A paper describes a structure:
[name] ([name]) deficiency ([name] Df) is an untreatable glycolytic enzymopathy that results in hemolytic anemia, progressive muscular impairment and irreversible brain damage. [name] is a homodimer with each monomer adopting the (βα)8 [name] barrel fold. Transitions between the open and closed state of the catalytic lid are coordinated with changes in the positions of prominent residues within the active site including E165, K13, H95 and S96.
The first is within the catalytic lid, which we found to be disordered within the TPIQ181P structure. We observed this in both subunits of the dimer; however, the affected regions were not identical, with residues 170-177 being disordered in subunit A, whereas residues 172-179 were disordered in subunit B. The electron density was clearer for the P181 residue in subunit A (inset), and thus we use this subunit in our figures and description unless otherwise noted. Residues 177-181 are observed in a helical conformation in both the open and closed orientation of the catalytic lid, demonstrating that the defect observed is not merely altering the equilibrium between the open and closed states, but is instead grossly affecting the C-terminal hinge and catalytic lid. We crystallized TPIQ181P in the presence of bromide, which we have shown previously to localize in the active site along with a phosphate abstracted from solution.
Residue numbers in the entry:
A (entry chain A): 1 to 169, 178 to 248
B (entry chain B): 3 to 171, 180 to 248
The structure:
Amino acid sequence: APSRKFFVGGNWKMNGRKQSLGELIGTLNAAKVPADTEVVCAPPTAYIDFARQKLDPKIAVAAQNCYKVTNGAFTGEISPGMIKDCGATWVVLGHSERRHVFGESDELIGQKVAHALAEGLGVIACIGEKLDEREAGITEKVVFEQTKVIADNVKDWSKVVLAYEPVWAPQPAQEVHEKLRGWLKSNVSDAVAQSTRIIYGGSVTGATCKELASQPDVDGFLVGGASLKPEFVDIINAKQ
Amino acid sequence: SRKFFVGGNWKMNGRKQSLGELIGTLNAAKVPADTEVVCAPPTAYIDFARQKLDPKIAVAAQNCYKVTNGAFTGEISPGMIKDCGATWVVLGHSERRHVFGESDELIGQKVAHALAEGLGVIACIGEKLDEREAGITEKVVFEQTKVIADNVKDWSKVVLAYEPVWAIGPAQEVHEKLRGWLKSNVSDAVAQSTRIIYGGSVTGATCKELASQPDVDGFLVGGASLKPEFVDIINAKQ
Ligand SMILES: [Br-]
Ligand SMILES: [Br-]
Ligand SMILES: [Ca+2]
């Protein structure tokens, strides 16, 4: 049915311990996820290896962040090389919490994108405007600036997914996704615009997934709180 | 007297194969009596390292955040660290302060949370070259220490690490001043019992002389912690 393969990422954020995450993983393994959804789970960094060992190999594992060189004097960071060594195949970059709580600049995010892709990871590249920005009427400026930094660091979009986070919060998600796809068409290529998944972040739940997934430019979801809950399986099945 | 303390900060280095080999060499080494050894692996390898290291060596995380769970993509909490079997966290490392912009206020909040959650804390302080050359080392490190101390109720599980950021090639002079700070601003008892470890460059060839200084209680070792000479550093008092 869709033009781009449906993509569902679950961002566990800074939540869970071995016991509770083991239970979450058991539930996902028992769901037998459909072949037509690409599912990725992003555990806290201390649990990437633990989670990859237990999770169904059909579900991919992402790190929630990484740094921009293979090794070095960066206490508290991890590199793409470590992510791959733990069996993870994706990284989430530019998440709103890294930008707005931890002050990660666009320049730094672009450098991380380039390094992660060179190292062979997939990247879930996050963008989004804050409340003050939406109220000031500059949604497009903000998300187009963020997207261009990402694009300037992407040579091959096959392993990139763009995630729009409505940090400020007919469907408003659809309006933004259509504009982002138009940006890709005009500034990268029609082929990249037509093939790149643009997934919706923020507060996706079992109650909103079917309506949002029916929007023509919404290709999936980056799921926060609901990724810890049984309803994540219903989100995976939003197109079934 | 104060138990000699040797921490190895692996920073953002190593993979399972190379860290497994490093751990084998540490497991085979004889750790002297009255010496507390701690290794701080990259965050992706805290659990791995704890599983492979002999219990004689403790594991530290290289950083943590200031609440137990929450919407902090990319962070880990003290509860997760303890769940992986680690018993320490390094907080305030110069790279966190200067590359990643962590404020004194944030570091203090992390210290309080990690202690409340049952971890030991290696709390790092230190001046940059421009501060050393301006003559303000003491002012800088005293203020950093004050923010830490305002967040420490019980010093039993705290170790203070002095890292002159520029010392990549004195220590005793600063350690003596920091101990005097503890004496005047906390208590004589805390000053006498708290380990103050040196986190500037330490190698096998410099460790014995540093360890003999009266106010140096051990080391937070950087690059040498990845190398065989870390075992010589563990033996710096022998
Ligand atoms: Br999220
Ligand atoms: Br260090
Ligand atoms: Ca001494």
